[model samples]
Each structure stands twice: as C-alpha cells, then as structure tokens.
Target: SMIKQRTLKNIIRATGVGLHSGEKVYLTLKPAPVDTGIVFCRTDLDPVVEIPARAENVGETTMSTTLVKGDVKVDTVEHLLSAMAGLGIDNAYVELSASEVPIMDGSAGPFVFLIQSAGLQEQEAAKKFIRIKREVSVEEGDKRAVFVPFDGFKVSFEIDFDHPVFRGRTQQASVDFSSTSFVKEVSRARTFGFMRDIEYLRSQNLALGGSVENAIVVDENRVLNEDGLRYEDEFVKHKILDAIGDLYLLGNSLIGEFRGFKSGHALNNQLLRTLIADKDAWEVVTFEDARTAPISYMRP
Candidate 1:
C-alpha cells in the first residue's frame, strides 16, 4: 500500500469529437507538480485560462458535467475525469484544443489506455484523501446518493431504466477499489443513452456528435450498437463509472462507501457539496507511510 502522489511520466496525445459540439478536439496530457491536482487548460484561447478540476468549479450538470470559470467553460469532463480517478492520477495538466473533452469511444477505456501508455511517476509528496467521518447524503426525490465511512473506497449502484431491454437483466453493480481493478472492472463500461430521446436532444442542440461509435444507444427492445454490450451488466456498470468520476470533483480520493439508487450526475455533485460544506462530515489527511492507509487508497 502506497499513498504517494503521482502524475504521468511523459506527455500523451489523443484526438476525438466532442459529444455536444460535434467538433474535433485534441488532448495533450502532461505531468504536473506535487500538489497541482488536475487542471484543464484551453490551449486554443488567446490567453489560455486554467480550469482546476474541483467540485466547487463545476457550474452545470445536465447530460454531462461542465466546469465554468470566469465565463470560460469546459464541457463533457466526466469520462476522462473518471479515468483519472480510476487510475489514481494525482496531478496532471490536461491541455485541450477545444472547450469540451473529446468523447473517445464513449467510455473511459481510451483515456485509461492513454494514461497507461504515458506511465505513472510517483511524486515525492504523500497523497491526500478525504476520510469520511460520518454519513453524508443527498436526494433528488426518489433518487439518492450517500457516502458512509469506510476503511477503503467502494461503490454500489442500482439503476431502473424504463425499457424492455433492461428487464430481468443485471441492473445492479458493486465495485470495491480495495479488491477490484478499476481498469478491468469499471473503466470499459461505456455511456448509454436512448434512441427515443435523440430527436429531442438534437432539436435542443445537444448530443449532436453522438453515434453508435460513441455511446450505447438503446431503443425499445435492444441496443443499437452492433457490437452489443461490452459487459453483460454494462448499463449499471457505466452508472458506477460516472459516479466515481463525479465524486472525484472533490479534487482528491475519498475513503468511504458510496451507495446510489437511481442516482445521476446531479445527486452525485450535490452529495459531494453537502459533504464538503459540512466540515465535521469529513477530514483531509495524508499518508506519508502507505502501510498505514487502507488497501483501496494505496492500490490505485
């Protein structure tokens, strides 16, 4: 178990189209210093502004998460953010040529690969984690997300989709970072949407770049993606993936058990803000000696 902070050892590059903008974008991931955390830079601007990947910086959450600072926006950040969290990347500069992060194959898989190919360099400083001291919860009517104190990080989620394709299928998923590999178990689960909403979304000028190549589109009876599902329980698994990304907005890892029942981006962000606002609910601590921390925090 090692709690040392880390960043990419070398710069990496990728290109894809934005999920909303329908425009090509380039990404250059480079290493950062010990406490830089993760920052997104719009290299295309005349005077590039850095957007720190922090929960408080997140301004909008609809179909995707958006971060706004000084009126400059970075859209569709969760998939890549999820990958950064899943791999336990501590500090990096994600230089983007566009406002939104490219939707690479609709999953965190590509970003996971990019991070792996770039390699990880453990920094000299210890990593900080928000240790949950008590339960923190938020509700969006029937949907709910909760964080309870735990020795290591874990997430359990269940989704109820209104479609025949989901009937009698595995609609629940649980991933324990302590004993599970995030890349193998969670990173490959792609985002899913409904073909039924395509018309409305397009009319509203959203999901303009979506296609079978990016997201798993479900119709009334089955998935439109010709390859079928990556995992038998892909739907719920993707929800868990999204939750992990959404929670990472805390700018650090969490030592807690996450429970989500039909929860979405809104509930996840709300619960995080509630936890941070309640000072007694959690505390930030660093582990200079990895052996003292839980397996989950050290493994990633």
Candidate 2:
C-alpha cells in the first residue's frame, strides 16, 4: 500500500493576535480533499479570497513569508506552515479572519496543538514529494541556502548574531526528519526580535503584536525574557524552523538535506525558487509501499 496524503479529520478554530497587524484574528483549520495542498482563505473579505501556499505565489519575505494572489495576500504564514510541514500534513484549508496568521507565542507550538487536536485524516491519494536529484544552492552575499539529494529530509542551520548572549551559546542545530519528531525537538523554538527594532517596526506596521510573551526579545547585551532560552541553541533552531516552513511552500515535502548559513525568509524563498527552476535538479516522487516511505513522513 502507498503512503497516504493527510489532512485534518475535523474543522477546528483558534483566536489570537496577528504579529504584524496587532489585531484580533481567527483561524479555522478545515479538512480538505486529496491534492488540495495548503490553501489559506480570507474570511474577512467580501469576496473571500483564497491564497494557495505556493513558492511562486510568495509576495514578500521581509519578517515573514507572505502569499499573494491578485490584490489579496496572506501575511506571516511561516509558523502555521511549519506546523503543517512538521506534522507531515499534505492538504488542508486555513481560514483566517485577517491578512496575517496569529502569532501564537511566535512559534509553531500552538499551531501544532491545534492540528493535533483536530486529528489527522488519511486521504486516498498517495503523498507526493519533491525529491532532489542534484544539488541546488542560492545565496545572498555571505548567506546561503543549499539543498542536496538525500534519502530523507534533514535541516542543518547555523546562525551568528553579534550579541553576548549569542556569542556565549551554541550557534548551530541539525534535524534529520527520518529519525526525529519535529514537535519534540524543534516546534517550540520561538522567533526572536531586537528591542531596538520595536519603534521602527511599529512605525512600519510590522511586528506590531510582538511582545516578550510572543517573541524572545534581546537588548544590546542580553535576553529580555525572564524565562530565557527554550533551548540553548533555540536561535539557530528557529532559523531551521523558518526554513522548513519556507521550503514547504513548494506544495510538496522535500526529500533532501537543506543546509543554511545565516539564512532568513528571503534567502530561503530564493533557494526554493532556484531549486524548482532547475528542472533537472529535482523530481516528483512517491513511495508505493508505506514501509518504504520516510519514517517521519508516514503515519504510524
């Protein structure tokens, strides 16, 4: 038997504040049929615009990945996408009350909880993957994002921040999805921000809802959050988290190893675009025998 595609078993909803909009937002996770992929619907709009989470549809990569189609767009989608990717979910409908996904603690933890609460549904169609056939690399100056053929999905990332807190801690992390549970190892790593950027970001109408509760805030010399680090290497792990979400926009899970060096949303998006553009670099694949599927990618 083939590995089945996945969606939620039931519709579920949650409410929170949009990280960029700083306004109340509602999210409804709806079960979708096979091959639906991950689509976001804007319920607040009169016409109810739908935005498919696809790499080519990505409009902005500033603080978060934004999906745009025509005049309607969805902002700050990485966290929610990361949750779905982590769970090996292939298709679902994310209905939102606003343009941005709510920043639940600025991490995918809450989203993961919401998805699990709804339970996973196995669809009749076999899951598909973007299997790398060759290496694909993209860069922005010193930053780089590279993907190479591998038997299973893995992420290796390094981050360097010029702060004493960062200078004193581990700056790298790796997750081999074939053997690891994304929820336990990486889902809780929260996105971070600098205290100095607060005024500037609010003035620009970005990160308007970012608070010590939602994000790990750093000052010139130390962390502002009293609880401190979730993981000693959480900063770099968060980079890995973002990369997973960014790459998932390809509409299928990647079967390769991703290497990142001080990469962000922009570089990650560029990497996906570059990889997909090279026809010889990747191929669509599926495992007919569920036993042959990547362990982490299949439902037990």
Report how far off residue 13 is in candidate 1 (Å): 0.7
Q: Model 1 over residues 1-300: C-alpha lDDT tens digits?
A: 347898998999999999988879999999999999999999999799899999899999988999989979999899999999998888999999998899989999999998887788888887889999999988978999999999999999999876799988999888988789888889999888899999899998789889989999999887888878899998898999999999999999888899999988878889989999999999998876676778443232
Predict model 2's lDDT versus the native.
0.89
On the 0 to 100 scale, the lDDT of residue 95 in model 1 is 93
What lDDT does each candidate get? 0.89, 0.89
Residue-level lDDT tens digits of model 2 in 217-273: 989888899988888888888888898999899999888999999998999999998
**Runs with alpha carbons beyond 4 Å of true place in candidate 1:** 296-300
TM-score of 1: 0.96
In Å, residue 202's CA in model 1 sits off its true spot by: 1.1
Q: Return the clash pairs for model 2, or none.
A: none
User: lDDT at 141 for candidate 2?
Assistant: 93
